[PDB]
Design a protein around this ligand. Structure first.
Ligand SMILES: [Cl-]
Length: 88
């Protein structure tokens, strides 16, 4: 499993992509499994907002959040992926 956030740095909308790494080719697949997951937006060791979706591609609204250092965390089937995200 892989997490990609675009663009970098974050504007009002961050596109999150959760692709499956194909076990044969090693290429990134946009899977039709569409399993539910949770996206958490963290800053200063506080979970500020969360979103729940089945879409591997999701636009995160960062509206209302000030400029600074954030962490985006995906919780999917027990597995977590966390990435530093700078909001300008
Ligand atoms: Cl944090």
């Amino acid at each position: 499993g892989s997490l990609t956030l675009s663009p970098n740095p974050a504007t009002d909308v961050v596109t999150l992509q959760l692709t499956e790494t194909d076990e044969v080719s090693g290429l990134s697949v946009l899977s039709t499994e569409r399993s539910a997951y949770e996206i958490q937006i963290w800053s200063g060791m506080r979970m500020l907002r969360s979103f729940r979706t089945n879409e591997p591609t999701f636009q995160i609204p960062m509206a209302g959040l000030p400029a600074g250092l954030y962490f985006v965390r995906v919780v999917k089937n027990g597995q977590t992926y966390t990435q530093k995200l700078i909001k300008k």
